[PDB]
Amino acid sequence: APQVVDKVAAVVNNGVVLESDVDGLMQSVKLNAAQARQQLPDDATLRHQIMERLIMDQIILQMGQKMGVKISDEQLDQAIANIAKQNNMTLDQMRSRLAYDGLNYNTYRNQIRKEMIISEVRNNEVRRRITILPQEVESLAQQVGNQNDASTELNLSHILIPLPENPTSDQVNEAESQARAIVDQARNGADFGKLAIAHSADQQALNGGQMGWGRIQELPGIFAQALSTAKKGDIVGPIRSGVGFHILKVNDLRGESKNISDAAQKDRAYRMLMNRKFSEEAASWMQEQRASAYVKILSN
């Protein structure tokens, strides 16, 4: 007869996690996986992971409340808009939200608010534990500064179609045909990473054939000659060689007018180093706070 409506799934310090919130995040991750179910095919492990997610969220929220961080509705305004691709946000966003979960308009904003609170506290503490030495940002940028001899640096990927030491004419023809087909498919908009994974015999095949940033003059002579007139996004044909056919792709390029004789580079090194240290400190803080708190799972 009686129907269970809601219950406490876990107790976290003075707060609680409700089965309703657990179901809400269940639906959230199910929708996320609907796009690609390979992201989260697990069910029980996913449920426990979400349990931990809500536990950490409650810990962080209680800590932030203790400190006194607060957010106004004015900060909420706009902090959602200009994000949905071309959406007419703050009027059309609300109307579309009615069709998915917007039974009550406030729900969405109350969630957004909460999330911002947690972010602001996390960022505050994690960055407070970070320490950066200039010597470190200098060393990280020194490699690129030395490698910036070229006025333009190219991000490149490569694919190899192999040949034996003593190939036959038929083998050469087959390799050339395969390379030309791959080049045509790439120029037709096919994913270069998938093609490299499927066909490339190079060690970077499983990595999508990505070679990364490089100075053109430091590349193999054939690569330097072929790429002398290449630009971002270009697909270049096969290159014959005693060991097979080589295919090259240009992903991105960078450069500046400053005379490198490094020059306005340590800022980017600072960004990357800060990102890495933030990740490490966040992991260490997310587990320093889980150990130190009181948690009891009553999910039973």
Partner 1 sequence: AEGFVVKDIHFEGLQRVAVGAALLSMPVRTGDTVNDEDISNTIRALFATGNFEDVRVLRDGDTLLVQVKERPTIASITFSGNKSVKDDMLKQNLEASGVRVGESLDRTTIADIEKGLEDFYYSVGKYSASVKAVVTPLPRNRVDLKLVFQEGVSAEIQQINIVGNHAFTTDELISHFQLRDEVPWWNVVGDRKYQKQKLAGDLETLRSYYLDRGYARFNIDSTQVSLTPDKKGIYVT
Partner 2 sequence: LFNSEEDVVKMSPLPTVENQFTPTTAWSTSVGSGIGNFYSNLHPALADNVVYAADRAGLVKALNADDGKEIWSVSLAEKDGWFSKEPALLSGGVTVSGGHVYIGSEKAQVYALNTSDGTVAWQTKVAGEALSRPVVSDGLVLIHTSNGQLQALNEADGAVKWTVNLDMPSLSLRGESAPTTAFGAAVVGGDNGRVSAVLMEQGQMIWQQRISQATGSTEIDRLSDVDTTPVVVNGVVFALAYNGNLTALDLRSGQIMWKRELGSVNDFIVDGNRIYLVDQNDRVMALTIDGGVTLWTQSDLLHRLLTSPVLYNGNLVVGDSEGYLHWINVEDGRFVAQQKVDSSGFQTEPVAADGKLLIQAKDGTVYSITR
- In the DSSP assignment, the letter for residue 295 is E
CA 286, 290, 295, 299 dihedral sign is: positive
Interacting partner of 18 out of partner 2, partner 1, none (Cβ under 5 to 8 A depending on kind): partner 1
Paired tokens of 136: 């470190």
104 binds partner 1 (CB under 8 A): yes
Indicate the residue type of 227.
L
Interacting partner of 284 out of partner 2, partner 1, none (Cβ under 5 to 8 A depending on kind): partner 2
Distance between CA atoms of residues 295 and 11, nearest Å: 6
Candidate ranges 3-11, 20-28, 42-50, 288-296; the one touching partner 2 (CB under 8 A): 288-296
Q: In this structure, how many other beta carbons lie within 10 angstroms of the beta carbon of residue 146? A: 11
Contact flags string 13-52 toward partner 1, x per CB under 8 A: xxxx-x-xx-------------------------------
Interacting partner of 169 out of partner 2, partner 1, none (Cβ under 5 to 8 A depending on kind): none
CA nearest to 245, candidates 140, 161, 129, 139: 161
Distance between CA atoms of residues 101 and 15, nearest Å: 25
Interacting partner of 2 out of partner 1, partner 2, none (Cβ under 5 to 8 A depending on kind): partner 1
Interacting partner of 291 out of partner 2, partner 1, none (Cβ under 5 to 8 A depending on kind): partner 2
Rg (CA), the chain: 27
CA nearest to 253, candidates 274, 271, 227: 227
Q: Which is nearer to partner 1, 8 or 224 (CB)?
A: 8
Count of all residues that appear for the chain in the document: 300
| Chain residues 131-160 in contact with partner 2, contact rule CB under 8 A | 131, 133, 135-136, 139
298 binds partner 1 (CB under 8 A): yes
Indicate the residue type of 90.
T
- In the DSSP assignment, the letter for residue 23 is H
5 binds partner 2 (CB under 8 A): no
| Chain residues 227-286 in contact with partner 2, contact rule CB under 8 A | 276, 280, 284
Q: Which residues of 233-251 are buried (b: 16+ CB within 10 A; e: fewer)?
A: eebbbbbeeeebbbbbbbb
CB of 133 to partner 2, least distance (A): 5
CB of 283 to partner 1, least distance (A): 23
Where does this chain bind partner 1 (CB under 8 A)? Answer: 1-8, 11, 13-16, 18, 20-21, 104, 107, 294, 296, 298
Binding site for partner 2 (CB under 8 A): 131, 133, 135-136, 139, 276, 280, 284, 287-288, 291-292
